Design a protein around this ligand. Structure first.
Ligand code: 8OG
Ligand code: MG
Length: 129
């Protein structure tokens, strides 16, 4: 069968709000309010897959780790796996290569609408809260 993995993480900061890449003052799309963790799949392990993206989507040296939640669902042969890593802190500024630089925003009320629907499955459950 065919499978496809994805890993994502909310970058926590001092303020306790997590820097989510969104808008970025006139960018490609305002619906890109997502976080690092794109291309972890490739051919690594559930852990060693994101570990490589973690630095690729942050670049800096942040106290980032742990898994807040992961969405596991398998479609007609083509299965999908989304692993969310609960980040705690980040030194300097996050760069890596996730997307359009975002601002430190409170995760207490993340918006699945303003963010890519590709990750809505997991965020939906919480966002709906
Ligand atoms: N249609 C299609 N989408 C895929 C495949 N593999 C794969 O990771 N994806 C998806 C799932 C991920 O959310 C995202 C990761 O970045 P890419 O699109 O660049 O591979 O794309 C695939 O073989 N076919
Ligand atoms: Mg990547």
């Amino acid at each position: 069968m065919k499978k496809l993995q994805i890993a994502v993480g909310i970058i926590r900061n001092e303020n306790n709000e997590i820097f989510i890449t969104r808008r970025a003052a006139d960018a490609h799309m305002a619906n890109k309010l997502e976080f690092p963790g794109g291309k972890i799949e490739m051919g690594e392990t559930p852990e060693q897959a994101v570990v490589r993206e973690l630095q690729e989507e942050v670049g800096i040296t942040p106290q980032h780790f742990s898994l807040f939640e992961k969405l596991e669902y398998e479609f007609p042969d083509r299965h999908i796996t989304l692993w969310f890593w609960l980040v705690e802190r980040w030194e300097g500024e996050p760069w890596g290569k996730e997307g359009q630089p975002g601002e430190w925003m409170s995760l207490v009320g993340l918006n699945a609408d303003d963010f890519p629907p590709a990750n809505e499955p997991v965020i939906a459950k919480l966002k709906r809260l």
